[PDB]
């Protein structure tokens, strides 16, 4: 009945949690889930909870909804105004699922090595794995221009821990047998430009944000590793010093940076948390400046839908107006989970080495 609005510091970490693809929702048919729905009924704001038909703070974390209550709500709300969220959320789900299954297959192919050809690599080196890029989940929409968020999702469980241990085995085999695989990045802070932008790959785009403008189907671009075959000039012996990433990545048991791949999916690569983190957490590297303007519409809507001083006292100086102003002002600084700031600071072989253009799954030494 009497209903109000939450803190803003609620909302910035709200943006955090959401853009993690992580928000809890209730369904008029599937109840409390986040798998498949045409209608997000009421939505979580941290420990708090807001009925998204009054957009009013209604619930807490010690509370737990069991069924729709009754209280005066505006009924001036339209799901159209925020589809973008759940859209991107399904994008997150699918994208990460793809990461998961792809590394399943990768590690699988790895676990087949014999001591014979292993000691060949010891003796000569060479690439060892042979997978086509035409077997990477066209069931997904990043690999099919006609799969969609609009589609249901077969659920997954404990993606986290499984990612941890798959990746664990990965770094295990690499820092042990000391490979030079498909993947290594010193500072990915210059992938889209900073690599040799060659061939039709130029049709790759980077908005650093999902958009109805684009489905995200694209190939997967690799570097020029073929030349150590081409030239007899930079192979195993040469590589027995430098191109091995761990020289700069240092130890793996000892860690103070992240680890990442060549650019693969979401039109991107992703980073991974260090061993001294207790986790090797994958993360799509993004920027938040657009995550700013999402609520650009929300502002005016409520500015109507709410009053002068209720709000001027509900949110900080400038109410929602100066709220957005100042928060915009602070965002890229303040909207930066220092996860984002876990790169390396060492490079002696440079990343101005090769172009990148779509390759297929392959790993060498």
From Swiss-Prot:
One of its GO terms (cellular component) is viral outer capsid. A zinc finger (CCHC-type) spans 51-73. InterPro entries: Reo_capsid_sigma3 (IPR000153), Reovirus_capsid_sigma-3_dom_sf (IPR023634). It is found in: Virion. One of its GO terms (biological process) is symbiont-mediated suppression of host PKR/eIFalpha signaling. Cleaved during virus the endosomal proteolytic disassembly of the outer capsid. It comes from the Viruses. Pfam families: Reovirus_cap. Keywords: Capsid protein, Host-virus interaction, Inhibition of host innate immune response by virus, Inhibition of host interferon signaling pathway by virus, Inhibition of host PKR by virus, Interferon antiviral system evasion, Metal-binding, Outer capsid protein, RNA-binding, Transcription, Transcription regulation, Translation regulation, Viral immunoevasion, Virion, Zinc, Zinc-finger. One of its GO terms (molecular function) is zinc ion binding. Stimulates translation by blocking the activation of the dsRNA-dependent protein kinase EIF2AK2/PKR, thereby inhibiting the host interferon response. Sigma3 prevents the activation of EIF2AK2 by competing with the kinase for dsRNA-binding. Heterohexamer of three sigma-3 and three Mu-1 proteins. The RNA-binding form is probably a homodimer. Belongs to the orthoreovirus sigma-3 protein family. This is Outer capsid protein sigma-3. It comes from Reovirus type 1 (strain Lang).
